[PDB]
Structure formats: structure tokens, C-alpha cells
Amino acid sequence: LHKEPATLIKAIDGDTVKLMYKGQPMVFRLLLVDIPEFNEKYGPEAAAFTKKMVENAKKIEVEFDKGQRTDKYGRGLAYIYADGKMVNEALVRQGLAKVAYVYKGNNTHEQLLRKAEAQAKKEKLNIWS
Ligand SMILES: Cc1cn([C@H]2C[C@H](OP(=O)(O)O)[C@@H](COP(=O)(O)O)O2)c(=O)[nH]c1=O
């Protein structure tokens, strides 16, 4: 897998962000995660976490997996990086997302995220509290 450049257009919520990628606006959906909805416990905290991460970043990068790159809604499916730190992993490590939507070909970082989820769950963090 390889990181590619992108620039933030707008934070949206815990697991979606609008990025300019190859000079076109796209909504990206974070691979391998599921978050509480905006009116469910921790929904707002997930949105705030991802917002700060992407807004404070000097450099955002998009890393597609091996399989499909857009979903049925036209959203990009990627691992997103903020100054080299993966947003998908950080959200999970904080107990603000669960590992989810693991489709065979687009699961390169599954075990990395599952390790983060186990740590959040041992810590009883947030959704695991
Ligand atoms: C994360 C992800 C979601 N999706 C689709 C499955 C779900 O379809 P349904 O809408 O039919 O439930 C939807 C979940 O996204 P959200 O969690 O953003 O709603 O996005 C993919 O198809 N591939 C993926 O990798």
C-alpha cells in the first residue's frame, strides 16, 4: 500500500471527511471502522476527535487498500493519515470506534486495528466504559 497526498476540505464526522484528492473534492469513509451515530453516546466525541486530528494536521495522506476504492454511495474508502498517524487506528485506540465492515481484499490493517481495539477495551475507554 502507498500513501498519496490530499488536502482537507471539511471535517464531517467521526468516520467521514471531505478531502481534495487528485484535485477533486471527495467524501472519504474510513476503512475498517464503525462509530456511534451523532445522537448516540460518543457520536459527538468521535466527530470532535477526528475533526481535531484532520484540522491540526500539516499533511493529510490517503492510502487505498487493495480492493474497492469507492463504495456504493460514491465515498472513497481509505486509510487516512494526519502527519503520519492513522486516523482509523487512533479512533479505535481511543475507544471512539469499533473494528467493523471488514471485507476480505480491503483488510490490510485489520490486525493493527484489532490490536488497538483490544487496548481500548482493556482500558475500558469511552465506548468500552
Ligand atoms: C466502511 C464501508 C462501508 N460500506 C457501506 C456498507 C454500509 O451499507 P448500508 O448503508 O447499506 O448499511 C454502509 C455503512 O456506512 P456508514 O457506517 O457510514 O453508514 O457503507 C462499504 O460498502 N464498504 C466499506 O468498506
mmCIF file of C-alpha atoms and ligand atoms in Angstrom:
data_model
loop_
_atom_site.group_PDB
_atom_site.id
_atom_site.type_symbol
_atom_site.label_atom_id
_atom_site.label_comp_id
_atom_site.label_asym_id
_atom_site.label_seq_id
_atom_site.Cartn_x
_atom_site.Cartn_y
_atom_site.Cartn_z
ATOM 1 C CA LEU A 1 0.000 0.000 0.000
ATOM 2 C CA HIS A 2 1.093 3.568 -0.629
ATOM 3 C CA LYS A 3 0.269 6.939 0.819
ATOM 4 C CA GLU A 4 -0.968 9.670 -1.587
ATOM 5 C CA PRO A 5 -1.435 13.381 -0.934
ATOM 6 C CA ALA A 6 -4.735 15.074 -0.203
ATOM 7 C CA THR A 7 -5.802 18.294 1.448
ATOM 8 C CA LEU A 8 -8.600 18.829 3.949
ATOM 9 C CA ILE A 9 -11.728 20.472 2.610
ATOM 10 C CA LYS A 10 -14.015 19.871 5.626
ATOM 11 C CA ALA A 11 -14.316 17.675 8.699
ATOM 12 C CA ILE A 12 -17.708 15.887 8.600
ATOM 13 C CA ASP A 13 -17.947 13.350 11.412
ATOM 14 C CA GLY A 14 -16.139 10.570 13.274
ATOM 15 C CA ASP A 15 -15.518 8.362 10.226
ATOM 16 C CA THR A 16 -16.053 10.605 7.187
ATOM 17 C CA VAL A 17 -14.106 13.608 5.975
ATOM 18 C CA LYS A 18 -14.207 15.704 2.794
ATOM 19 C CA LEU A 19 -10.780 15.839 1.125
ATOM 20 C CA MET A 20 -9.412 17.181 -2.150
ATOM 21 C CA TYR A 21 -7.812 14.165 -3.750
ATOM 22 C CA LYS A 22 -6.088 14.360 -7.163
ATOM 23 C CA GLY A 23 -7.596 17.854 -7.378
ATOM 24 C CA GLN A 24 -11.242 16.687 -6.946
ATOM 25 C CA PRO A 25 -13.476 17.015 -3.854
ATOM 26 C CA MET A 26 -14.392 13.620 -2.345
ATOM 27 C CA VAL A 27 -16.069 12.382 0.818
ATOM 28 C CA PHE A 28 -13.870 9.620 2.304
ATOM 29 C CA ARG A 29 -15.219 6.885 4.605
ATOM 30 C CA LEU A 30 -12.595 5.422 6.956
ATOM 31 C CA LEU A 31 -11.896 1.768 6.254
ATOM 32 C CA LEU A 32 -12.479 -0.969 8.897
ATOM 33 C CA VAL A 33 -14.377 1.176 11.477
ATOM 34 C CA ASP A 34 -17.910 1.812 12.723
ATOM 35 C CA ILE A 35 -18.786 4.721 15.099
ATOM 36 C CA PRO A 36 -21.835 5.601 17.277
ATOM 37 C CA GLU A 37 -24.295 7.807 15.393
ATOM 38 C CA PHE A 38 -24.260 11.538 16.037
ATOM 39 C CA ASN A 39 -27.080 11.235 18.527
ATOM 40 C CA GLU A 40 -25.728 8.082 20.238
ATOM 41 C CA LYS A 41 -23.275 8.137 23.148
ATOM 42 C CA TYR A 42 -19.804 9.087 21.960
ATOM 43 C CA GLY A 43 -21.023 10.083 18.448
ATOM 44 C CA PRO A 44 -20.150 13.720 19.040
ATOM 45 C CA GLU A 45 -16.839 12.864 20.740
ATOM 46 C CA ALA A 46 -15.813 10.728 17.675
ATOM 47 C CA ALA A 47 -16.634 13.670 15.382
ATOM 48 C CA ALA A 48 -14.573 16.056 17.594
ATOM 49 C CA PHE A 49 -11.665 13.634 17.770
ATOM 50 C CA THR A 50 -11.410 13.152 14.010
ATOM 51 C CA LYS A 51 -12.009 16.885 13.400
ATOM 52 C CA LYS A 52 -9.073 17.926 15.599
ATOM 53 C CA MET A 53 -6.845 15.303 14.126
ATOM 54 C CA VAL A 54 -7.505 16.346 10.498
ATOM 55 C CA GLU A 55 -7.735 20.107 11.149
ATOM 56 C CA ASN A 56 -4.448 20.263 13.088
ATOM 57 C CA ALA A 57 -2.532 18.195 10.513
ATOM 58 C CA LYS A 58 0.114 19.852 8.404
ATOM 59 C CA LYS A 59 -0.119 16.933 5.955
ATOM 60 C CA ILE A 60 -3.071 14.613 5.206
ATOM 61 C CA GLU A 61 -2.483 11.418 3.222
ATOM 62 C CA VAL A 62 -4.888 8.840 1.674
ATOM 63 C CA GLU A 63 -3.921 5.168 1.495
ATOM 64 C CA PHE A 64 -6.258 2.962 -0.521
ATOM 65 C CA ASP A 65 -6.290 -0.762 0.202
ATOM 66 C CA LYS A 66 -6.109 -3.490 -2.452
ATOM 67 C CA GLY A 67 -9.848 -3.801 -3.187
ATOM 68 C CA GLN A 68 -12.626 -1.415 -3.971
ATOM 69 C CA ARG A 69 -11.701 2.284 -3.650
ATOM 70 C CA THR A 70 -15.230 3.738 -3.664
ATOM 71 C CA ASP A 71 -18.360 2.479 -2.007
ATOM 72 C CA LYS A 72 -21.900 2.256 -3.374
ATOM 73 C CA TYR A 73 -22.518 5.858 -2.210
ATOM 74 C CA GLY A 74 -19.537 7.318 -4.092
ATOM 75 C CA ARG A 75 -17.429 7.671 -0.953
ATOM 76 C CA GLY A 76 -13.718 6.961 -1.103
ATOM 77 C CA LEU A 77 -12.650 4.061 1.088
ATOM 78 C CA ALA A 78 -9.224 4.609 2.576
ATOM 79 C CA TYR A 79 -6.862 4.714 5.486
ATOM 80 C CA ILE A 80 -6.451 8.374 6.340
ATOM 81 C CA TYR A 81 -3.163 9.750 7.848
ATOM 82 C CA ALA A 82 -2.665 13.042 9.718
ATOM 83 C CA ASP A 83 1.072 13.872 9.973
ATOM 84 C CA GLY A 84 1.833 10.186 9.526
ATOM 85 C CA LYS A 85 -0.615 8.972 12.236
ATOM 86 C CA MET A 86 -3.524 6.837 11.049
ATOM 87 C CA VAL A 87 -6.911 8.367 11.928
ATOM 88 C CA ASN A 88 -8.636 4.989 11.619
ATOM 89 C CA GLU A 89 -6.295 3.405 14.175
ATOM 90 C CA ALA A 90 -6.291 6.373 16.540
ATOM 91 C CA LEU A 91 -10.086 6.479 16.669
ATOM 92 C CA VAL A 92 -10.187 2.787 17.524
ATOM 93 C CA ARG A 93 -7.358 3.083 20.097
ATOM 94 C CA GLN A 94 -9.382 5.818 21.840
ATOM 95 C CA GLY A 95 -12.478 3.630 22.138
ATOM 96 C CA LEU A 96 -14.409 6.005 19.838
ATOM 97 C CA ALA A 97 -14.841 3.386 17.031
ATOM 98 C CA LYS A 98 -15.173 -0.431 16.727
ATOM 99 C CA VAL A 99 -13.446 -2.544 14.096
ATOM 100 C CA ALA A 100 -16.265 -3.264 11.562
ATOM 101 C CA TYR A 101 -17.031 -3.652 7.827
ATOM 102 C CA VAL A 102 -14.077 -5.971 7.307
ATOM 103 C CA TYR A 103 -14.367 -7.110 3.712
ATOM 104 C CA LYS A 104 -11.805 -9.700 2.510
ATOM 105 C CA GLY A 105 -9.319 -7.667 -0.076
ATOM 106 C CA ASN A 106 -9.753 -4.414 1.819
ATOM 107 C CA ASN A 107 -8.416 -5.503 5.202
ATOM 108 C CA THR A 108 -4.683 -4.918 5.161
ATOM 109 C CA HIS A 109 -4.694 -3.101 8.530
ATOM 110 C CA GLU A 110 -7.250 -5.320 10.292
ATOM 111 C CA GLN A 111 -4.928 -6.842 12.832
ATOM 112 C CA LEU A 112 -3.339 -3.429 13.606
ATOM 113 C CA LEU A 113 -6.813 -2.052 14.367
ATOM 114 C CA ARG A 114 -7.908 -5.134 16.329
ATOM 115 C CA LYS A 115 -4.840 -4.716 18.500
ATOM 116 C CA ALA A 116 -5.854 -1.071 19.144
ATOM 117 C CA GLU A 117 -9.400 -2.126 19.939
ATOM 118 C CA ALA A 118 -8.189 -4.713 22.473
ATOM 119 C CA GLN A 119 -6.095 -1.995 24.202
ATOM 120 C CA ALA A 120 -9.064 0.461 24.322
ATOM 121 C CA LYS A 121 -11.257 -2.326 25.682
ATOM 122 C CA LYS A 122 -8.678 -3.356 28.373
ATOM 123 C CA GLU A 123 -8.571 0.355 29.368
ATOM 124 C CA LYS A 124 -12.355 0.473 29.419
ATOM 125 C CA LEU A 125 -12.128 3.590 27.270
ATOM 126 C CA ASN A 126 -15.179 5.520 26.117
ATOM 127 C CA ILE A 127 -17.492 3.094 24.229
ATOM 128 C CA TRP A 128 -15.959 0.270 26.337
ATOM 129 C CA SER A 129 -16.538 2.131 29.621
HETATM 130 C C1 LIG B 1 -16.775 1.143 5.626
HETATM 131 C C2 LIG B 1 -17.527 0.588 4.415
HETATM 132 C C3 LIG B 1 -18.916 0.814 4.294
HETATM 133 N N1 LIG B 1 -19.589 0.351 3.220
HETATM 134 C C4 LIG B 1 -21.042 0.515 3.081
HETATM 135 C C5 LIG B 1 -21.712 -0.616 3.834
HETATM 136 C C6 LIG B 1 -22.927 0.022 4.513
HETATM 137 O O1 LIG B 1 -24.030 -0.071 3.605
HETATM 138 P P1 LIG B 1 -25.522 0.255 4.179
HETATM 139 O O2 LIG B 1 -25.683 1.761 4.061
HETATM 140 O O3 LIG B 1 -26.352 -0.382 3.110
HETATM 141 O O4 LIG B 1 -25.694 -0.216 5.581
HETATM 142 C C7 LIG B 1 -22.531 1.490 4.627
HETATM 143 C C8 LIG B 1 -22.094 1.795 6.053
HETATM 144 O O5 LIG B 1 -21.504 3.094 6.109
HETATM 145 P P2 LIG B 1 -21.813 4.078 7.363
HETATM 146 O O6 LIG B 1 -21.319 3.373 8.625
HETATM 147 O O7 LIG B 1 -21.069 5.293 7.058
HETATM 148 O O8 LIG B 1 -23.280 4.227 7.386
HETATM 149 O O9 LIG B 1 -21.372 1.691 3.859
HETATM 150 C C9 LIG B 1 -18.909 -0.398 2.196
HETATM 151 O O10 LIG B 1 -19.646 -0.836 1.274
HETATM 152 N N2 LIG B 1 -17.574 -0.618 2.265
HETATM 153 C C10 LIG B 1 -16.877 -0.225 3.380
HETATM 154 O O11 LIG B 1 -15.675 -0.504 3.441
#
